[PDB]
Amino acid sequence: AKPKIDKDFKGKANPDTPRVDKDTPVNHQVGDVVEYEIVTKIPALANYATANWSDRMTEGLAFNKGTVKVTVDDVALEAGDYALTEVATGFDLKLTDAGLAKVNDQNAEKTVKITYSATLNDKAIVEVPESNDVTFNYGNNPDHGNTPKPNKPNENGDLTLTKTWVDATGAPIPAGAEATFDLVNAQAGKVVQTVTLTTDKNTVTVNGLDKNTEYKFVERSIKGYSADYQEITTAGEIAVKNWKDENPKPLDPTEPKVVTYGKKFVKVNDKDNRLAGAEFVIANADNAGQYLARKADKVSQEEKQLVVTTKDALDRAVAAYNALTAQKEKVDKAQAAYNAAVIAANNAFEWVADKDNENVVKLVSDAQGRFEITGLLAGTYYLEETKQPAGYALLTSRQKFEVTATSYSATGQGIEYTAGSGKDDATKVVN
């Protein structure tokens, strides 16, 4: 009777028997190309006027335009069978009359498969998942529904919902019913707040949200109305239009999640004094092996140049600081600028045999001894010091560290990343 849907990583999707652990994010490294598949079962003897799929992704996943492929019963559709619209944050794929004829009026269940990919990018934050979000909007009447578009709150934590209503022709009409929405953290898929719009007030502001987190208002199905989520035009505002299409509720599968990991370090001496200007690379073995580098063909000339120029300025700041008596915030700022340039340039990682390779990632301690690495797979890695802090001997041994699902954030480690934090969330490196 009703169609069935699932979305998962390529090869895992199963509309009949969806995977049990979907909610648990799968560890990837920055630059990974994540392959997705949507599988939809359409019943025999269907007579749909609309069969539309739409997907929107959180900002750390860059939809790869041109990667969409669609098959029915493992047979490729023709260009004329669907209308595909691609945007920075995803796509909409709508069957034309020609495409509908291939899933309608069939004597057996039809299986639609849509595959595509997205690239995990440098906007991803360690331990915060990234996600897509597919909705299948269908019915015997034309349907105007689509998938939610995630959005961040305004600077002060406010996110506002506005709802309007139209008939099947697009003409405004009064609210047809009370409308309930679940405000969902779009990264993790957890509901944070439920709101209800009465028939006389079509807007509501939710306060206290995280300005660096994406959310979405997911409409609970209202009988005979389809939810058309408007493109995002500004932070802190989400608009929804309800069409009186008189179609069934849409299909809304449980999407998988991806996540990257990281590690924090503090450079100190034997008295726990924090040291600026120590430089390190990362190796994949306790001796020999390879070193962590950004992939040269995935980084622009401008991105590479910024790493170099900010490093030069950091070198100058470290020099000027080291000249000061015990009795510079300049170092911290310069180091943060360099760190930001490194993150922006680290679009993808690879392992290289030559530690002198110009693309090898180089970490530098600030005036609080701090340095860090983000965007990694879990594993056992090894720091190698390449430049000692002024006045100290070069370390001779590599230092083992473990990257895990909580290694960036957890206490129970060597030292406070930032003194006084109360969290021992960094690896201690002693000079």
* Residues contributing to the site for Na ion (CB under 5 A): 133-134, 252
CB nearer to Na ion: give 240 or 266. 240
**Beta carbon of residue 168, minimum distance to Na ion (angstroms, whole number):** 24
CB nearer to Na ion: give 22 or 398. 22
CB nearer to Na ion: give 253 or 369. 253
- Residue 370, token pair as written in the block: 């701090």
Tell me how far apart the alpha carbons of residues 92 and 88 are, in angstroms, rounded to a whole number: 12
**Beta carbon of residue 128, minimum distance to Na ion (angstroms, whole number):** 19
DSSP string, 65-127: TT--EEEETTEEPPGGGEEEEEETTEEEEEE-HHHHHHHSS-SS-EEEEEEEEEEE-TT--TT
Tell me how far apart the alpha carbons of residues 322 and 298 are, in angstroms, rounded to a whole number: 36
Burial class (CB in 10 A: 0-12, 13-18, 19+), 267: buried
Q: Cα-flanking dihedrals φ and ψ of residue 316, to 5°?
A: -65, -40
Closest residue to Na ion in the complex (CB)? 252
**Beta carbon of residue 58, minimum distance to Na ion (angstroms, whole number):** 13
CB nearer to Na ion: give 134 or 259. 134
**Beta carbon of residue 170, minimum distance to Na ion (angstroms, whole number):** 24
**Beta carbon of residue 55, minimum distance to Na ion (angstroms, whole number):** 8
Q: Are 165 and 175 in contact (CB under 8 A)?
A: yes
**Beta carbon of residue 8, minimum distance to Na ion (angstroms, whole number):** 12
CB nearer to Na ion: give 54 or 310. 54
CB nearer to Na ion: give 145 or 389. 145
Name the β-bridge partners of 144.
Answer: none
DSSP string, 20-57: TTTTSPEE--TT-EEEEEEEEEE-TT---SEEEEEEE-
